[PDB]
């Protein structure tokens, strides 16, 4: 009960900031997550024994892929932790419980391939899940782990509170399908501007949580430039591998996934920042003003990619 997780001074201070990098020591990442759970939710939210056994099962079920790996899971959870901590009173107890878990589990058993490649490969999962293929799989893996003996971290919740939290996690993980982001932010943009956005309306809370999940999932672009730049290498390592696999199916991949077209990457990043990243953090900042530092960092990184195109680096 009285066993608190404590980090070294530099981590204790920087973990509160949006642009925190969780560092290269894999064996510290579980403690970093438990720390965030305790501060964000409370020490009483989860039985420490069950939480630690849940975390280590989740870790085992992420693969050794360049980007969609255990470090991404913890990185996304940290961005969520910084959003919740900066928006103390806006979220219920169930939401703070569910959302940190959702982020940790949002990419469980990712193979480094997109929904499009699964579809064109004719992968079994594309037969079982027609849309949001990988994200339905990620939620399925999450339920599977929660049902392992000694792994049900939500055991102390009532039947209705257990169903509510598992529904928050399901919608939260499905929201990380980027195909669904574009419509979700447009609807939120309309609701904000026409003034009809209501945080007591559950349908509106769902959309706002969806956008939060996109914000955390893309948070590679909200880091200090050296982290953003080095993470981009891991991102493109997965894209170029999928491109190779598209060429093996006899399909020319989109330039984003063609390793022959690396020269085009800097302009590709501008498109992504202007079409996905900047819009996402702008709407988030409109709804949740204290998340402004994600937008600012994102704009700083947009400017660094412009400098790359201009040959200044
Ligand atoms: C049309 C186009 C072209 C392109 N190029 C790369 C080289 C050739 C053309 N890159 C993108 C965006 C990539 C992307 C996607 C998700 C991302 C998610 C997080 C961070 C960066 C991301 N970047 N889009
Ligand atoms: Mg995903
Ligand atoms: Zn992700």
| Rounded alpha-carbon distances, angstroms, from residue 229 to 88, 218, 260 | 31, 14, 20
Structure tokens at 257: 């996934």
Q: Is residue 7 part of a domain?
A: no
Q: Are 287 and 192 in contact (CB under 8 A)?
A: yes
Count the domains in the chain: 1
217 assigned binding-site residue? yes
Q: What DSSP character marks residue 252?
A: P
16 in a structural domain = no
Backbone dihedral angles phi then psi of residue 271, each to the nearest 5 degrees: -55, -50
Among 157, 165, 172, smallest CA distance to 80 is for 172
**Residue that is written with structure tokens 């979220």 in the block:** 91
Contact 30, 55 (CB under 8 A): yes
Domain for residue 20, yes or no? no
CA of 203 to the centre of ligand 1 (A): 31
Measure CA 180 to chain center: 14
Tell me, in angstroms, the distance from the centre of ligand 2 to residue 10's CA. 30
Q: What is the CATH number of the domain that holds 235?
A: 1.10.1300.10
Q: Distance (Å, rounded) from C-alpha 313 to C-alpha 306?
A: 10
Residue 21 lies in a domain: no
Nearest to 290 by CA among 1, 100, 18, 3: 18
Q: What phi and psi values does residue 258 have, to the nearest 5 degrees?
A: -95, 110
Which protein residue has the closest C-alpha to ligand 1 atom 19?
218
In terms of Cα–Cα distance, which of 170, 195, 3 is closest to 99?
Answer: 170
Give the residue among 171, 166, 174 at the shortest CA–CA distance from 147: 166
Report d(CA 16, CA 9) in Å as an integer.
12
Quote the Cα angle for 92-95-99, to 5°.
150
Torsion over CA: 258, 264, 266, 272 (sign): negative
Contacts 24+ apart (CB under 8 A), 160-169: 161/94, 164/94, 165/94, 165/97, 165/98, 166/98, 168/94, 168/95, 168/98, 168/99, 168/102, 168/209, 169/98, 169/101, 169/102, 169/105, 169/139, 169/142
* Residue 222 within a domain: yes
Residue 152 burial class via C-beta count within 10 angstroms: exposed 0-12, middle 13-18, buried 19 and up:
middle
> Is residue 2 in some structural domain?
no
Resolution, Å (one decimal): 2.1
Tell me the longest C-alpha to C-alpha distance in the chain: 59
Q: The domain containing residue 38 runs over which residues?
A: 28-310
Cα–Cα distance for residue pair 180/186, rounded to 1 Å: 11
Q: b or e along 282-310 (b: 16 or more beta carbons within 10 Å of the residue's beta carbon)?
A: bbbbbbbeebbbbbebbbbbbebbeeeee
Question: Residue 18: inside a domain, yes or no?
Answer: no
Closest CA to 213 of 188, 249, 235: 188
> Alpha helix locations (H) across the chain?
9-14, 29-40, 48-60, 70-86, 93-105, 115-121, 124-128, 133-146, 159-175, 178-194, 202-217, 225-248, 265-272, 278-287, 292-309
How far apart, in whole angstroms, are the C-alpha atoms of residue 228 and residue 175? 23
Catalytic residue among 19, 38, 68, 138: 68
Q: Which residues line ligand 1 (CB under 6 A)?
A: 218, 220-221, 235, 255-256, 261, 264-265, 268, 271-272
On whether residue 4 sits in a domain, the answer given is no
Find where tokens 């990712």 sit: 110
Method: X-ray
Query: In whole angstroms, what is the distance from residue 249 CA to residue 254 CA?
Result: 14
What does residue 22 show for φ and ψ, rounded to 5 degrees?
Answer: -75, -5
Which residue's CA is minimally distant from atom 4 of ligand 1? 268
| Burial class of residue 27 (count of CB atoms within 10 Å of its CB; 0-12, 13-18, 19+) | exposed
From residue 103, give the alpha-carbon distance in Å to each of 112, 125, 186, 281: 17, 21, 23, 17
| Long-range contacts, 148-156 (Cβ 8 Å, 24+) | 148/57, 150/49, 150/50, 150/53, 151/50, 151/53, 151/54, 151/57, 152/50, 153/46, 153/47, 153/50, 153/51, 153/54, 153/101, 154/97, 155/47, 155/50, 156/47
Among protein residues, the one whose CA lies closest to atom 2 of ligand 1 = 268
151 is in an annotated binding site: no
């Amino acid at each position: 009960g009285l066993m608190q997780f404590t980090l070294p001074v530099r981590l204790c201070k920087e973990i509160e900031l949006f642009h925190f990098d969780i560092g290269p020591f894999e064996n510290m990442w579980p403690g970093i997550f438990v720390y965030m759970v305790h501060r964000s939710c409370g020490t009483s939210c989860f039985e420490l024994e069950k939480l630690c056994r849940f975390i280590m099962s989740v870790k085992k079920n992420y693969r050794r892929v360049p980007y969609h790996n255990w470090k991404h899971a913890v990185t996304v959870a940290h961005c969520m932790y910084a959003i919740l901590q900066n928006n103390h009173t806006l979220f219920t107890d169930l939401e703070r419980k569910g959302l940190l878990i959702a982020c940790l589990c949002h990419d469980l058993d990712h193979r480094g391939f997109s929904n499009s490649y699964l579809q064109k490969f004719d992968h079994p999962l594309a037969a079982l899940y027609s849309t949001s293929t990988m994200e339905q799989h990620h939620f399925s893996q999450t339920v599977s782990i929660l049902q392992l003996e000694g792994h049900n971290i939500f055991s102390t919740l009532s039947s209705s509170e257990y169903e509510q939290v598992l529904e928050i996690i399901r919608k939260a993980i499905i929201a990380t399908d980027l195909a669904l982001y574009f419509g979700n932010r447009k609807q939120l943009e309309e609701m904000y501007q026409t003034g009809s956005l209501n945080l007591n309306n559950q349908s509106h809370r769902d959309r706002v949580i969806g956008l939060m999940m996109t914000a955390c999932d893309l948070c590679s672009v909200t880091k200090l430039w050296p982290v953003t730049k080095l993470t981009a290498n891991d991102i493109y390592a997965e894209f170029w591998a999928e491109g190779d696999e598209m060429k093996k199916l006899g399909i020319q991949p989109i330039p984003m996934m063609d390793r022959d077209k690396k020269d085009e990457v800097p302009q590709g990043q501008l498109g992504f920042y202007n079409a996905v990243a900047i819009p996402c953090y702008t709407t988030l900042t409109q709804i949740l003003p204290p998340t402004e530092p994600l937008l600012k960092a994102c704009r700083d990184n947009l400017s660094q990619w412009e400098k790359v195109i201009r040959g200044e680096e």
